[PDB]
Scaffold this motif. Structure first.
Motif, PDB file in Angstrom:
ATOM      1  N   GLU A  71      17.285 -24.085 -13.213  1.00  6.08           N
ATOM      2  CA  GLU A  71      18.497 -24.933 -13.276  1.00  6.08           C
ATOM      3  C   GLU A  71      18.437 -26.069 -12.317  1.00  6.08           C
ATOM      4  O   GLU A  71      18.209 -26.023 -10.938  1.00  6.08           O
ATOM      5  CB  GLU A  71      19.907 -24.031 -12.859  1.00  6.08           C
ATOM      6  N   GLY A 130      20.962 -23.187 -21.360  1.00  3.25           N
ATOM      7  CA  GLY A 130      22.269 -23.820 -21.536  1.00  3.25           C
ATOM      8  C   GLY A 130      23.465 -22.871 -21.720  1.00  3.25           C
ATOM      9  O   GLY A 130      23.460 -21.887 -21.159  1.00  3.25           O
ATOM     10  N   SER A 131      24.407 -23.323 -22.548  1.00  5.41           N
ATOM     11  CA  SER A 131      25.371 -22.577 -23.048  1.00  5.41           C
ATOM     12  C   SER A 131      25.215 -21.673 -24.106  1.00  5.41           C
ATOM     13  O   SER A 131      23.961 -21.652 -24.671  1.00  5.41           O
ATOM     14  CB  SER A 131      26.607 -23.570 -23.426  1.00  5.41           C
ATOM     15  N   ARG A 181      22.534 -19.364 -17.652  1.00  4.40           N
ATOM     16  CA  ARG A 181      22.266 -20.628 -17.579  1.00  4.40           C
ATOM     17  C   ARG A 181      21.344 -20.968 -16.532  1.00  4.40           C
ATOM     18  O   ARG A 181      21.197 -20.300 -15.322  1.00  4.40           O
ATOM     19  CB  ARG A 181      23.377 -21.597 -17.190  1.00  4.40           C
TER      20      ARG A 181
END
Length: 261
Positions: free
Chosen positions: A21, A148-149, A224
């Motif tokens: 991240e 990600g999402s 994430r």
């Protein structure tokens, strides 16, 4: 407003994210003076680690270390733009801060030679999922993808990615347990329609098709910031500026930055 811009920071305050991240600072206005913005951003890490800024576009800059984060690292971000001219008379509307932590090292590798997506947590294999990736005419790009999402159910529409639904490579598909891994439209998701091909043949438009059970597991256990690396496909490489392809940019290039651009 007008001469005022509001910065937005990711990940969320208090969030636990994976080792891939990046810190992301997004402005609601284009930054004329990237150098000023970078100077106004203070990032503290513990354990301490060197990192650098790189702009994905005119409104968003990213900051990350040379290698993936070490699990347990605590990160504090201070975007102090109030009173700062971010270029051409534009000042920060206010200051923002965020604190997040790095969780376990989760890296899932999809090898086109084996058609298997292997999830490793802190180096240990916890899942081996047969997968079916992009067919030769619409291949999955090789590279490092940042998770990600995630959605329990959503529709993936090719027109979102510049491909008409009515065209040969078009689609408007309902999918369960979808985890997005690229802004370009690649997801790891439930694909009951390709269970036969999974582990043998690529049949998708680029997504990593896996079994419903495996997709749900992926949705529940991957977060994430976790990493998905695709290797050996006939595709190219995910763009460094995809939005989730940060790690595909060589460190020397990233460290060099692009503030004077």
């Amino acid at each position: 407003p007008a001469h005022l811009t509001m910065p937005y920071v990711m990940p969320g305050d208090g969030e636990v994210v994976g080792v891939g991240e990046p810190v992301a600072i997004r402005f609601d206005e284009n930054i004329a003076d990237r150098g000023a913005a970078e100077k106004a951003i203070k990032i503290t890490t513990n354990p301490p680690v060197e990192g650098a800024f790189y702009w994905l576009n005119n409104r968003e800059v990213r900051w990350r270390p040379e290698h993936f984060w070490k699990p347990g690292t605590a990160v504090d971000v201070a975007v102090n733009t109030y009173g700062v001219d971010l270029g051409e008379g534009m000042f920060g509307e206010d200051n923002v801060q965020t604190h997040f932590t790095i969780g376990d090292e989760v890296i899932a590798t999809a090898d086109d030679n084996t058609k298997i997506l292997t999830v490793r947590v802190n180096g240990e294999v916890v899942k081996s999922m047969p997968t079916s990736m992009g067919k030769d005419s619409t291949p999955t790009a090789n590279g490092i993808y940042i998770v990600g999402s995630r959605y329990k159910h959503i529709i993936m529409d090719s027109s979102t990615y510049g491909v008409p639904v009515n065209s040969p490579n078009g689609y408007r598909t309902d999918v369960d347990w979808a985890t997005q891994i690229s802004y370009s439209g690649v997801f790891v998701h439930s694909a009951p329609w390709s269970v036969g091909a999974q582990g043998h043949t690529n049949t998708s438009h680029g997504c990593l098709n896996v079994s419903p059970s495996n997709a749900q597991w992926f949705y529940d256990h991957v977060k994430r910031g976790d990493i998905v690396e695709v290797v050996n496909t006939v595709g190219g490489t995910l763009p460094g500026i995809d939005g989730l392809g940060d790690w595909n940019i060589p460190w020397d290039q990233w460290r060099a930055g692009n503030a004077k651009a």
